[PDB]
Amino acid sequence: NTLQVRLLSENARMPERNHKTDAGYDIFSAETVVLEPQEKAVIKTDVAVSIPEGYVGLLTSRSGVSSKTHLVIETGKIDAGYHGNLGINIKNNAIASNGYITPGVFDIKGEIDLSDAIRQYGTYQINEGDKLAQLVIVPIWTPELKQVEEFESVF
Amino acid sequence: TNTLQVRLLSENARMPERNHKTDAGYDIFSAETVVLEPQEKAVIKTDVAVSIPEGYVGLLTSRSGVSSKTHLVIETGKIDAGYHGNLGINIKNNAIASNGYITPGVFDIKGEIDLSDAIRQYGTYQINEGDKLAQLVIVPIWTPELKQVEEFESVSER
Amino acid sequence: NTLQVRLLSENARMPERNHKTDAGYDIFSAETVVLEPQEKAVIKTDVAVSIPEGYVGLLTSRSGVSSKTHLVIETGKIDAGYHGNLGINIKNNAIASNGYITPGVFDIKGEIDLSDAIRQYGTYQINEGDKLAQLVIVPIWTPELKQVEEFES
Ligand SMILES: O=c1ccn([C@H]2C[C@H](O)[C@@H](COP(=O)(O)NP(=O)(O)OP(=O)(O)O)O2)c(=O)[nH]1
Numbered sequence A: 001n002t003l004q005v006r007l008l009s010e011n012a013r014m015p016e017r018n019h020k021t022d023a024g025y026d027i028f029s030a031e032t033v034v035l036e037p038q039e040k041a042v043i044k045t046d047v048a049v050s051i052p053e054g055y056v057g058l059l060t061s062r063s064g065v066s067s068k069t070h071l072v073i074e075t076g077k078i079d080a081g082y083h084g085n086l087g088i089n090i091k092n093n094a095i096a097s098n099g100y101i102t103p104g105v106f107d108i109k110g111e112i113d114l115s116d117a118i119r120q121y122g123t124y125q126i127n128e129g130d131k132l133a134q135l136v137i138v139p140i141w142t143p144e145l146k147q148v149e150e151f152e153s154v155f
Numbered sequence B: 001t002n003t004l005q006v007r008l009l010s011e012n013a014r015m016p017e018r019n020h021k022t023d024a025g026y027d028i029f030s031a032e033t034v035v036l037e038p039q040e041k042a043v044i045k046t047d048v049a050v051s052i053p054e055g056y057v058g059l060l061t062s063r064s065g066v067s068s069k070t071h072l073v074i075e076t077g078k079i080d081a082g083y084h085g086n087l088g089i090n091i092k093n094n095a096i097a098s099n100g101y102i103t104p105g106v107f108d109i110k111g112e113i114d115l116s117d118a119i120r121q122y123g124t125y126q127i128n129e130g131d132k133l134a135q136l137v138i139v140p141i142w143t144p145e146l147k148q149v150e151e152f153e154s155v156s157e158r
Numbered sequence C: 001n002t003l004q005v006r007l008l009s010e011n012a013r014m015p016e017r018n019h020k021t022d023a024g025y026d027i028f029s030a031e032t033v034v035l036e037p038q039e040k041a042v043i044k045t046d047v048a049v050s051i052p053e054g055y056v057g058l059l060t061s062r063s064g065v066s067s068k069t070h071l072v073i074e075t076g077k078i079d080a081g082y083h084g085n086l087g088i089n090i091k092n093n094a095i096a097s098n099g100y101i102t103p104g105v106f107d108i109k110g111e112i113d114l115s116d117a118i119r120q121y122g123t124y125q126i127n128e129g130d131k132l133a134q135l136v137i138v139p140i141w142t143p144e145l146k147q148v149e150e151f152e153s
């Protein structure tokens, strides 16, 4: 069995399962997005996948990025019927600077890069080609629902 | 197999929906109308019980639309097999303290503004009874016996 | 049908499957960590597991802790080939105190316990041995990727 991947642009990058021990496929950003404190965005990956029916994709966060930054990704559930552009549902959860601006910006590693503008402190800049998320595909059970008045089994 | 038993617990409850055979989960609806102000938490009653078979888990989780377009944050709940109680949606309005700013309207799960009966704080969401708020995705699980060891041995692939 | 578990210290505790009908294994903290508003930390469990290839661990939250407190755990993905100390990626999401301090601290149950110092309000204290998270293991599909110009059946 094989999983079809379709690159939707020149900025897209084939997801990578580097190590046979890895559970997921490394997902890359396909755009450069500046994300200020408390701001939400959907980072385009320019990647389409054709997941077979009987599975679900979990487009989810990386432990490193999650633990070292205020970038919060909401785990996306990829259906078999979705052949469109995979988006990373992200938010910069840092508190508003209320004024403090510095000539640098934070990256997904937590380190500081030189920036084109003097932007608010706690601003992250997601660069094109960044390992931003991972895709873990798991089998699903999708039976038919039967309404009963009582079950036949026993916070 | 190929059947999941569902119990509607009240007149406000609504049968979960698998719209498309291509969908991975079942859409879950709210069984109550809840006003939720900034930074407030609640557990939304669905008035729905399910009987998940042994060897599986339910993931009561968010919808991408609601999550991306609003400040409504659902913490993905893990529904165990043998759990026949009311499924609750673990929700929080993650909007910032609106200070004193109040408007005659409230936000819905779509992000749009509705006219309200009271003048509430800006960023207040109102979850309406019957709203498609979350989805239930059922996944198989591995629940082996645990063996404490001093050192790990290699293991064959699944 | 067995999973290898290694306890890495005296503070460690064997994960427990609560009713045996349950899907995950309750994980306990092996350390005492005081966590103030908006602070992030990785709570050591001092427990290693060897999950075989073809599975993923979901180190995720408990509904009680999650719904009753401001403690936010990001679900960690435990790969096969990770045989190290399992860490709980946690954050006290309580709002920045205005400067308010009380002689007590909040617990993972939401109740107030007396602490040795007068700390900021909304500060949580995770105690050694606290049932903090659970581990749910699910099978995974890791096929080979084939790039296409257009999708087929
Ligand atoms: O909360 C966590 C998350 C991950 N882990 C482990 C499991 C996983 O195998 C490893 C991190 O893997 P991820 O892919 O989730 N993040 P990252 O890509 O940053 O780590 P690495 O560079 O090693 O691949 O650390 C924990 O112990 N606790």
Ligand SMILES: O=c1ccn([C@H]2C[C@H](O)[C@@H](COP(=O)(O)NP(=O)(O)OP(=O)(O)O)O2)c(=O)[nH]1
Pocket: A059, A074, A075, A076, A077, A078, A079, A080, A081, A082, A085, A086, A087, A088, A089, B062, B063, B064, B065, B066
């Ligand atoms: O973050 C993402 C990115 C993409 N997607 C893709 C994959 C999925 O199949 C599709 C819709 O997923 P949801 O069911 O979570 N969105 P929603 O329920 O709000 O609307 P709809 O089901 O009508 O698309 O969009 C996400 O779900 N989350």
Ligand SMILES: O=c1ccn([C@H]2C[C@H](O)[C@@H](COP(=O)(O)NP(=O)(O)OP(=O)(O)O)O2)c(=O)[nH]1
Pocket: A155, B060, B076, B077, B078, B079, B080, B083, B086, B087, B088, B089, B090, C018, C061, C062, C063, C064, C065
């Ligand atoms: O959001 C929800 C809604 C319902 N439930 C149900 C299903 C689950 O079987 C039951 C308990 O789930 P958890 O183990 O994750 N929470 P907790 O550990 O606090 O409760 P318990 O002591 O029963 O294990 O509550 C959730 O877990 N999360």
Ligand SMILES: [Mg+2]
Pocket: A062, A134
């Ligand atoms: Mg990784």
Ligand SMILES: [Mg+2]
Pocket: B063, B135
């Ligand atoms: Mg949907």
Ligand SMILES: [Mg+2]
Pocket: C018, C026, C062, C134
């Ligand atoms: Mg539990």
